[PDB]
A paper describes a structure:
The MLL family enzymes share an evolutionarily conserved catalytic Su(Var), Enhancer of Zeste, Trithorax (SET) domain14 as well as four highly conserved SET-interacting proteins, i.e., RbBP5 (retinoblastoma-binding protein 5), ASH2L (Absent, small, homeotic disks-2-like), WDR5 (WD40 repeat-containing protein 5), and DPY30 (DumPY protein 30).
In parallel, the cryo-EM maps of RbBP5-NCP and RbBP5-WDR5-MLL1SET (MLL1RWS)-NCP subcomplexes were derived from the MLL1RWSAD-NCP dataset and reconstructed at 4.2 Å and 4.5 Å resolution, respectively. The secondary structural components of MLL1SET,33 including the α-helices and β-hairpin of the SET-I, SET-N, and SET-C domains (dotted circles), fitted well into the cryo-EM map. Similar to MLL1SET, distinctive features of WDR5 and ASH2LSPRY were also well-defined in the cryo-EM structure. Importantly, the WDR5-MLL1SET-ASH2LSPRY subcomplex did not make direct contacts with nucleosomal DNA, which was experimentally confirmed by the gel mobility assays.
Numbering used by the authors:
A (entry chain B): 32 to 334
B (entry chain A): 18 to 331, 336 to 354
C (entry chain I), D (entry chain M): 12 to 118
E (entry chain L), F (entry chain H): 20 to 101
G (entry chain C): 3814 to 3950, 3954 to 3969
H (entry chain K), I (entry chain G): 37 to 134
J (entry chain J), K (entry chain N): 29 to 121
The structure:
Amino acid sequence: KPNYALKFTLAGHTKAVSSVKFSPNGEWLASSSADKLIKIWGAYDGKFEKTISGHKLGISDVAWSSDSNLLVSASDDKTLKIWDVSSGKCLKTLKGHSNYVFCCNFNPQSNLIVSGSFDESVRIWDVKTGKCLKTLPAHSDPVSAVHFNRDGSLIVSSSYDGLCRIWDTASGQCLKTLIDDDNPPVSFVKFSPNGKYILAATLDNTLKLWDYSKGKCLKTYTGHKNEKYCIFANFSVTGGKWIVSGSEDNLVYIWNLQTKEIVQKLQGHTDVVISTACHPTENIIASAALENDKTIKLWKSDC
Amino acid sequence: DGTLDCISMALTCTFNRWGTLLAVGCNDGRIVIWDFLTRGIAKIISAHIHPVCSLCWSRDGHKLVSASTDNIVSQWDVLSGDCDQRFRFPSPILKVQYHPRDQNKVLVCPMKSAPVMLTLSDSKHVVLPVDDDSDLNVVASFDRRGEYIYTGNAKGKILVLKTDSQDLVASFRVTTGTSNTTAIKSIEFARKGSCFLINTADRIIRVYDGREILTCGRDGEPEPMQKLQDLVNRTPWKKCCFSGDGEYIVAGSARQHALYIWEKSIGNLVKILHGTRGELLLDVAWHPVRPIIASISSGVVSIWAQNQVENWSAFKELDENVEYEERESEFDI
Amino acid sequence: AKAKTRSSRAGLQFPVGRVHRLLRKGNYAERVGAGAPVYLAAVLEYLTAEILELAGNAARDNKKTRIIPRHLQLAVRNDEELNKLLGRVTIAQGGVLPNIQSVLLPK
Amino acid sequence: AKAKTRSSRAGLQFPVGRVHRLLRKGNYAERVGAGAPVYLAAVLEYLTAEILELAGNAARDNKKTRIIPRHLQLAVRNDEELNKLLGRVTIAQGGVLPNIQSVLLPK
Amino acid sequence: KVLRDNIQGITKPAIRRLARRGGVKRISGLIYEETRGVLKVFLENVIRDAVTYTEHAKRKTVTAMDVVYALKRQGRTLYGFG
Amino acid sequence: KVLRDNIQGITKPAIRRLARRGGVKRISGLIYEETRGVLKVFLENVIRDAVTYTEHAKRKTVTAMDVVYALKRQGRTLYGFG
Amino acid sequence: LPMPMRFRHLKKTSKEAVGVYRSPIHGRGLFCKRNIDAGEMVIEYAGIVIRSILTDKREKYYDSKGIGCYMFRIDDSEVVDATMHGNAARFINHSCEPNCYSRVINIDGQKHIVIFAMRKIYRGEELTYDYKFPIEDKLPCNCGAKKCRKFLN
Amino acid sequence: KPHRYRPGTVALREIRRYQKSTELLIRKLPFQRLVREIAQDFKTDLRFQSSAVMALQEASEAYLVALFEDTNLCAIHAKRVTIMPKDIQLARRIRGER
Amino acid sequence: KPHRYRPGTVALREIRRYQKSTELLIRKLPFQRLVREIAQDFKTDLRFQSSAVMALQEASEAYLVALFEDTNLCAIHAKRVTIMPKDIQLARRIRGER
Amino acid sequence: TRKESYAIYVYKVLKQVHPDTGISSKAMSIMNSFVNDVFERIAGEASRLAHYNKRSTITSREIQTAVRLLLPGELAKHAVSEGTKAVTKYTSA
Amino acid sequence: TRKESYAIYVYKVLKQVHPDTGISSKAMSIMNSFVNDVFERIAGEASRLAHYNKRSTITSREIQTAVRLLLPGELAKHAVSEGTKAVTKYTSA
DNA sequence: ATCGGATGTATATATCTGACACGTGCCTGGAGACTAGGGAGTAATCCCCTTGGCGGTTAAAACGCGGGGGACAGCGCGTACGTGCGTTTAAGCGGTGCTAGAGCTGTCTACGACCAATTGAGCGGCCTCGGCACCGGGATTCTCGA
DNA sequence: TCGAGAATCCCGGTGCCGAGGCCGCTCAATTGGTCGTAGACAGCTCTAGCACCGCTTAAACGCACGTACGCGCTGTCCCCCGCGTTTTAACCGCCAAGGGGATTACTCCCTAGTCTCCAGGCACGTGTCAGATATATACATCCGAT
Ligand SMILES: Nc1ncnc2c1ncn2[C@@H]1O[C@H](CSCC[C@H](N)C(=O)O)[C@@H](O)[C@H]1O
Ligand SMILES: [Zn+2]
């Protein structure tokens, strides 16, 4: 039962927030919104670092490079853009997606970028050349969550068609297709810290922790509110092992890892908590809510 | 099955310790480290002005020794790209090979002189002994763990020396079918175990076990663990290699520009990958952690994957008509 | 003075004494090894058993108690080693084993 | 008592004494007739006469005095009865008599 | 009693019966006489040697043993007659 | 010193030379190995019997006389070696 | 070529003879990745061989899951059902002018539903056969051919 | 309406029953007269054992069967079912009988 | 301009000179090695007289020439000039070697 | 005139192999002639071999070599095994 | 080792038929082996003939009949005439 | 691709028999016992043929490479041959009858076997030289584009 | 279709070793007695062969006829012949160590030969059932209309 208390409320995004991601060094937080802008913030004190502009439509997903220096932003303009966080310049521009890119993520070596779009296609892109290296008709619905595994050899992918599809990267094979004996729209998905497991956020107020080494769901997390928006979840291993997730009831739920019991309820947001980011080293949770709030909030626990 | 156009004047190739980068010798005398996942070049180093004919990777994958056609041998780091060291010797070098368990020691097979083991820390050189002292063309290579050195002459002799002492720990003379002698074209090893192979001038490849070679010791009568050849076309092998595991053996036919892949346990031919007849096959290599094969021919790199039933296959997929065992409660409620 | 023939002493049927006398009266060599007639009769007994086995097999195959020359011909032709032994040999009332080439059969 | 060879009284060149010795040591009969070696030696002499005659004929036709095996082969294959006598006989360094089939000729 | 031309006693049905036994379906006519010839040829050898044996036997009739010996000398031996 | 596969020592030019000697103009490739086979087959008999003679001779080397006797027993005798 | 032997050669070479890509006819379609001459086996419709008496109860059962009913009538007794467990032959599109035709051939006493080539099919062509579906009261046919029945039924 | 078998079928059944049967296929007395006619050429007034001439006849018949067999096989190699005298001459040539 | 003879003509002249010549047509040492390889199958360490193995080789060569001859003649009977392995098998079958 | 044969021994070995099976008289004569022929073959072979060794004694070893020359493979194998068994039983008398 | 042959007699009959012609020792040995072969032939067939007649004395009549067996036609005719002439000459003294 | 009919073939049965299994008395080859000699087996010695290796050469094999040449496929057609059905013919059974010649026994005598005494026809061994094998060069004749 | 070109034939010339002629050195051929015996021959049976003839009939010759395989021709394809170049290892000549091949010299264990006896084998009678034969029957299979 952590005691995450509110230390700083981060606000300034003039539209619906969509993604907040702590920098891998924990020094900055990239708050993205539908306002075509990213906002770099001081991840330890809520100090507004800067705003990176240049996109044409709402940025649905943003993701840091594995070295805290670069940021990939997938915007509703059907394009991705890689900006140097240390300077803000658009180092790369990724064109080719025919629809709304809903998810973008680096590989563990930060040399690859996986991007799932509204066009139901997952595309693999370079970082030093930015060219689209691969493309797959991954799902039958807009792909809203893509993520490399612990080492970049495998990519888990989520779309609105309930499929939790794990693909090979060296050859692009649709290795596994996790289904929970139903078709609930799985909005978000991600691997485990050890890569052996995979957390899938479904749009029925459910977080399913599957054993990817087994291919079957092990843990269930219910009691939160996630039905429409692509709510982002976090693992807490730096301090207490928690499962943190924003919610559509202005609350940020925090369950125990093993027991799957609600161990804390970070209230204070006034809108749907659209995104959550876990500090890579510290016990700082950046919980960002949607347009009726437009605020990110830093929460620090002592247990 | 894949190719690399971004590489020009490709002559030699070599995978890193993990199968992540490919060092390519550029006939203008350059080194192109081409990266796999980005599908692009990872580094470019204009080493010398003379072409590069040999390369090898360090254990950590950071040091690269290279031999040029101008008797030059130089080391370069994968990050700095600078000349770590540069040496010159008579009898132009045919091969250089990092000691697989010591990135300081390096074996050097020259054209005419006996092979020599050098170190990159100190400018020393220990010449390896040769049986007849008149072969003038001897291949030599460390084993998988750099514990020994196998040396094959032009007369079918095989001397297994202790790399540190250069002293005979095993020996035997190989035949050429009837009883004859032959030029040992190459002494190749596998990334797993002691299962190594010998390419000779008789267009026949002989897989052996180095443990059994040490077992026979000095002047034994060892039979090859496996025998491979182009029994149908009688084709000499410009190059041969194992697979990443050691159960598959690739041989490059420059005579017809094809790739014949056999097994090691049984030795039967896995299959054949046919390249264009016009291209002159030059170099072959296997992806040490993938069933993929890189080939170099006429300055062009070609990829040869071995894919699975997937990329669309995963409803459930079956092969043949499955007669469902009708349970006794099938029509029951 | 116990009487016991060399055939009995070898436990065989073919007369060792008769074949020995025959070799003596056959003018093949000045002297003969004593065990040579035994060996020769043994070989003859073995091969005769071999052939008559297949002979009786074909006979009972035709429900025949007494073997007919056709049976011997079929037996020697079916056996590879025997035929090779008797390829340049013909048999009275032997005939030819059934043999039809492929293209002879209509289609 | 001067000893003339039996071949002299027989008027032959092949050694009839050697012939009778080979007969007695060949184990073909208990005793060889008196005139049998003479007869067979005469037959052998006549055969040799015919053969070497044809051989020398062929050799002179090939502008040669020394008779090589080729001449013997050609002489053998050039005479019908000799060939039939030695059809089942291979000859060393003989080769084949020059023979080309009809259809093989160009047009 | 002088005998002549009994080679035509070999009837065409007999030749075709032999062919059927040999496993022959269709035959040309020009075979028959040739067959006869070959037959005679075969005969022309063995029977002669036969009487030759009979000649050395100082006998007037031919013995089955004699033709057995002939076929033996001709490398075409036969069984069932001693 | 163990010997193996020297049947391929029989070169295709040698086979075609033998064919020309036999009076053959055009040949298929599939003949060669078959030839080899047949050759071996021939060999497979005589040489064996050869050592068999040598075996009975209680000797270690093979004598020309032995193979002459073998070919004699095989009805393919040869002249010029005793 | 024996029917079992040709069936085995089909099972061996069908995977390198058929493919599944985007179908201009309907969704995902079987395509001819290499020239398929007439008479040669195109692809077996692999799937669970059930009895026809088992179809209805299974059909209704499949109505509980809404998964595509992949059933082809073997004969008056059995049916190949490939709804959940089958092969790529499910994705062959109906074609009123089919370059392929359906048969049920016997192999050592077991009936396999094999689609053979009605005509010489060529590389890149979408492999399609006639479902032999009866006339209904109408599933529109997108074969694009000339003699389309205006429907699958 | 009268029926006639297709050609060869009757001959095929004949082949079957003949390979099945084992008796002789040549009438005795004509063969014996032929043997006597051939014998009188080398010496007149030569008698014969019945078994002797019978063995002659049967050995000759078997020799002819072997000739028919390998000639028919050669004709197969000649891509024909109808034998031709050149085929028999060829077979004899191969058998060393020429 | 370069000249090339019509096919077979060179081979025809080869046939002529080979029927004319009488030396061996197989290289000695390979044949001898083959003989030793065949011999070691029945017993190892068996020596050979030079004349012995020479006689082996020449007898085998002559046997092969006879086989080539009658196979070529059979191929003529097959109305072809190019020999086929079935022709050799047929010839061996006729020679009683099967 | 007593005419020697082998019919009794053929009948004996037949009963020893097939007690129920009978035999024809003509077939019996065929068998007898066959035995005579093969025995003559092996006898001539042994004599010729001994002559090649200039040994006037025909012993068992000559018989073994002759039959090994005459019988194809396993025929000769079983034959020489039976002959060795018989000669050993004879020596142990 | 005093090895017996016929070479001198071959040369003799050569000079008798072809005075100004040479030979090769190879072809000489060929002719020698041929002589030995036809000789052993005649010997075997004469012995087998006498065996068939149950005789034990191979005499001139047996030789002549053996030649009649082995040689074809006029070859055998001239051979028989020569043998008879030589026998007559030898018996005349 | 099928069914109906015709015809040809495997089956059960009855009985007839004649080869065939069986039993005999009488013969003689085979066994048993014994003696001679000497072929075969063993040993020590020499040779020498072989088996193995070595270096240089190139004729030879391998490889490849057009490309015209024939294997082969199919297709028309027609002659030659299977076939069912006629006819007439000698084949076969058998039974008689005559004896010519195999096939037998008993001489009796010439005839090699064999051994012993004798030695020059013949054979390993040694010069030796001349047809012959090889070479190179020039004239001869086949063959492929006009 | 008359030349060009190429593979060949022959001629002169060179040098060689196998063919041949000649030489000592036997042992194997010759000579002459002597002996036991192979068979040459005489002279007998009898039987198997030879031929006669009649009676029965399956079997052979010829007919007509459909028809289908042999053949003759065509166009295709491929593929093996020809030639050029590149490779290699056969060959050739030599050297060398030895391991078996051949040899001689002993030594004797086995076989031939002799004689004795009897007992298995063989010709010879004798029931007797395996199958050969014949008939009616059910089954298998071609062939043609559909
Ligand atoms: N010829 C055709 N035209 C339009 N739809 C078709 C069709 N054949 C089959 N279908 C549809 O496709 C389904 C069969 S699966 C056939 C392949 C199809 N393209 C697919 O991706 O699924 C059926 O439900 C049917 O409704
Ligand atoms: Zn359609």
